[PDB]
């Protein structure tokens, strides 16, 4: 049959469109398109998680991957290797053309024949896409801001921990040096000097209690902000799949509109 009516023939699509149509596909998935030079035919085959390009040369109405060009039509060349392996041609490629990417399923998204109907629907989709795009970009800002402030708070908490260790080292230092002097003043009857040491110790303990409580309040803030990060992260992991599909539906309605209108 004609190559235009064949499903796996896509005409003038780029290597990038093929990559997306073959992204994460199983070995054996294939499609045929025109040459980027624009043999005028390139076969793309999925094998080993890669996209292998196989050029289809054309000499005097004869086709083939290499000369001698045995086949007379790209359809007969494709169907033959759809039923036999590619190892007979090149041993590195040991697979067959099994799963075809059809232009039939691409036409199933758009469900309106009228050009005014596709255009009206395109405007709806493109409107929704910009709405969800601006929504996503706002969530991303909150995501970045929250992630940064969480890192700031955690570093500050590390600083609180080291500060408290230093102030607690002071208490031990004062305890060591005192007692020896506290005992001497007790025999020396200088009770006023005992109170000055005791008062300075109470001044150190209260400052320590305040620093500890500043760290506790910061830890409570970190607990609340960490929960807000998880919620933002969830709301983004949910709109990301929807934004992709919405953009692709928008792009297909653009494709339908271009192919249905005058071209150069």
């Amino acid at each position: 049959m004609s190559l235009q009516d064949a499903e796996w023939y896509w005409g003038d699509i780029s290597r990038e469109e093929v990559n997306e149509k073959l992204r994460d596909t199983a070995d054996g998935t294939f499609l045929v398109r025109d040459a980027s030079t624009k043999g005028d035919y390139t076969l793309t085959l999925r094998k080993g998680g890669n996209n292998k390009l196989i050029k289809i040369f054309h000499r005097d109405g004869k086709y083939g991957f290499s000369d001698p060009l045995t086949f007379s039509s790209v359809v007969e060349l494709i169907n033959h290797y759809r039923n036999e392996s590619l190892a007979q041609y090149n041993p590195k490629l040991d697979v067959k053309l099994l799963y075809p990417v059809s232009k039939y399923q691409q036409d199933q998204v758009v469900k309106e024949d009228n050009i005014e109907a596709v255009g009206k629907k395109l405007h709806e989709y493109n409107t929704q896409f910009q709405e969800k795009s601006r929504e996503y970009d706002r969530l991303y800002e909150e995501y970045t801001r929250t992630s940064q402030e969480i890192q700031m708070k955690r570093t500050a908490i590390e600083a609180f921990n080291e500060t408290i260790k230093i102030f607690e080292e002071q208490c031990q230092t004062q305890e060591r040096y005192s007692k020896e002097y506290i005992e001497k003043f007790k025999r020396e009857g200088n009770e006023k000097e005992i109170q000055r040491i005791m008062h300075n110790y109470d001044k150190l303990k209260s400052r320590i209690s305040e620093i500890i409580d500043s760290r506790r309040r910061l830890e409570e803030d970190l607990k609340k902000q960490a929960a807000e990060y998880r919620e933002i992260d969830k709301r983004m992991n949910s709109i990301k799949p929807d934004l992709i599909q919405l953009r692709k539906t928008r792009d297909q309605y653009l494709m339908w509109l271009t192919q249905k209108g005058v071209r150069q």
């Binding site: 998680g49 196989i54 002097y181 040491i197 300075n200 992260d233 799949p241």
Partner: protein, 970 residues
Amino acid sequence: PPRPSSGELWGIHLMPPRILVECLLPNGMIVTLECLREATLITIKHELFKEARKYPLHQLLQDESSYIFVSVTQEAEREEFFDETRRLCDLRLFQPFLKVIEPVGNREEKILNREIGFAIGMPVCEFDMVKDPEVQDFRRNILNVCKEAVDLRDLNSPHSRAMYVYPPNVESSPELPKHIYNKLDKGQIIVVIWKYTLKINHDCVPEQVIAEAIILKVCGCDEYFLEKYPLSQYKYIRSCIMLGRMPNLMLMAKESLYSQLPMDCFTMPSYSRRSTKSLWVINSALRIKILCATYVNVNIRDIDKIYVRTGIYHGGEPLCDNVNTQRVPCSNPRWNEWLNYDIYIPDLPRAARLCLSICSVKGRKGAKEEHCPLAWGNINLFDYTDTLVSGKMALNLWPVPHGLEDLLNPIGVTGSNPNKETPCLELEFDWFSSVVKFPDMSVIEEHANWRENDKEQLKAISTRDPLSEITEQEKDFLWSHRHYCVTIPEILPKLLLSVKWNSRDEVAQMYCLVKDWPPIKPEQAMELLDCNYPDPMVRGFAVRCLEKYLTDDKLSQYLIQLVQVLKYEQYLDNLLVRFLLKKALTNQRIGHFFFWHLKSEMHNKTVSQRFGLLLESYCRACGMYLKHLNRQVEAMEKLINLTDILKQEKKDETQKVQMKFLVEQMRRPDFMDALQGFLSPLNPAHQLGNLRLEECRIMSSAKRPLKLNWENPDIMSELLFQNNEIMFKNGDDLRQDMLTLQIIRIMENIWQNQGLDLRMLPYGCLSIGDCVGLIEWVRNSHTIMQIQCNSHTLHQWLKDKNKGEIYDAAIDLFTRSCAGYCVATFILGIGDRHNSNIMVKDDGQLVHIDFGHFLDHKKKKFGYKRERVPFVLTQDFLIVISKGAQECTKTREFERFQEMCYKAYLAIRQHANLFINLFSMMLGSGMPELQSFDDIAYIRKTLALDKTEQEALEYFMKQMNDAHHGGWTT
């Protein structure tokens, strides 16, 4: 960790004039002392010990001189303050307290590590905690590169030291372009040495210009002619010839400069002091066990199930089909499934890597089910010791970068996420009763030893661009003639793509070809360093090409990409990083930007450890320039704190109030000392002397950028520039515009060499941190809208400004500026231009600002598959080019303008390999507009690489006609 902010205290951007400071004496007492915010530690320690007598146990305190202060910094470090001349407000204290202790340990070593930690933005002591043996081995082993440089730096006595501090800023070739040489009088140039004007040859050596007097330095900056390079090859002289400027130079005695050299001395740090089955012997397939994960962030109703997607990768290409685990619910992330891959273990290449990710599947709309990656992680299958991984392993996963839609991220960095508050995936590799290792090159070289029509093809394949399609037939054709390719060395990249990297037989053979492969040009070797060529042998050959044929100015010109490709390296200790570190330590102009490119990404946790270790090794050996770099860092830190105050606590105040606050703060002693007398990060040859406060002003824009003005303290500053103006931006990511200006600077270099004086003004632009950077302020420039505040308005402004004989000079500059910008913007796809994006100088030089997005950035927002013409020459621009003539499209000036655009477009098209490779080396940079090789496809269309050279010119002429609505003819 790195500082949360740049304020003087945690939660406080500015200390009050006076502040209470808790002092912890060594006797246990705590003294509350009131200090001035700008008081020094030697003063605070003096007042503290006079006050300490009024407190108990004062007798057992020693002399003031026997103690120093210690406190916790905002980086959570316990910093000992050995320099007691520092002010309280400059200490970066977390809280206002000081502890008194006696100094202990190696004092000189602690002072250096603190200075290195300041420049890095991270305390050096954190590297000592790293348990990873690869990190420690890097810190020790990298020192031999440091020792080599400091030895090669002080062996020629003064000279070798000077060439380091003031390297010659010369071209890569002394050959003078035709249009440059024609500006000379019979092959000679007139130069003025400070007035003693004289005419001398252009090929003459500086020493013979000195003999013509009856060391040299450029007037107004710190550039010195310290080598016998042809005076024309020096960039300053080469530029004066093109622009027709009089080269004003200065002479001085070599002893007057050699005395200012500080005999840089490197000292070995403290960390320097303090069975295996072959991979080919193994006989089994590759299998990995995905044990479990801890958690994932997604609500249970909007996502059906979750699974782990894995894949064995060799750079960007998978070595075999990807393998998914079973789909489990979000709440029970446990698999314990031995995933089997279709790859035989002995065929695993050296650079083999595992790329995995936790994905969410939601099959709820038709038959198409959406897959979204939640987290990702990469692991080198061989560690830095050629040892295959075995046993169990825990891996903390990274967030998915913005814009990435693929389910895996093989471009990403390897290793675990240092943030342990993230999903953690536990893996388990198998074991073979012993250690597994890669076989040595000598113990594998035996495995490898174990026409005309074809010539026309091979030559044509090497002329292709690095991203052109490569069919499987052409791969077999390249692999079949892999021994005849040595005559055409430039074909190596295409040949390496033809190898079956999942086959030990073909890999071993390719090793023996690159071992004895003739060196290729540097611009072609850089391709072998991108994410497509991960193998060590391949990357080693590329490094050796740069070592032999990469000049210092091309190294400085391509330094951005060469730093970015460091992220692609599997391991910290590689030949590329040793080469780059060596050059940074032997050329200070290279080291300056080497430091700032690394420093600007220390906030990025994906590379902070790698770039932190590299910065440590550099600062530890860069000599006396560490002092100047710290002066630059603290200057930027106070500008960050100032702009943080204006955009946070004072964002709802008028500019009259903010300026009053600005001039008040900028007049303080601590602020004047930090922001006066230091080298400009945009160009260390420029000295930022004292501030001109009357010219500094907050810009009336949403982002609130700051325009700053310094005096040029050079004696002959009148010859070049007296005002040094810079815009300081805090909030806008400038990496994209730093890259765009670099590419434009590279494009202008290509045009000048091909004899096309398409003069461009590539002003400086440098990113120094997260959304913080500097931009050189072009003097005497105004926006096109400002000029209009009629079609001849722009032309009359250039008439009123430059009158008489100056008219012809300005029109030529405006026209030649459009040619470059018109071509560069269309090729790169810069954001559309308008009367505010475009500016003009009084001399006619056109300056585009805020390039913003580039490549097909609108294709995602609006799926219009068309190449845009961002810079459309309005009627205003055509009148200026035509010298005011109506029917501008039909004028002789417009015909020459088109000839420039046509020649420049083909010129860049002829060097398309370089530009494709430059972008390819940025794929792991983090710019959402440049994530995959499919994003680079935009310049393959604008340059029409899939068409003939005549078709490309017709394509460019069609794009220009369709955007200007006719007028372009050939």
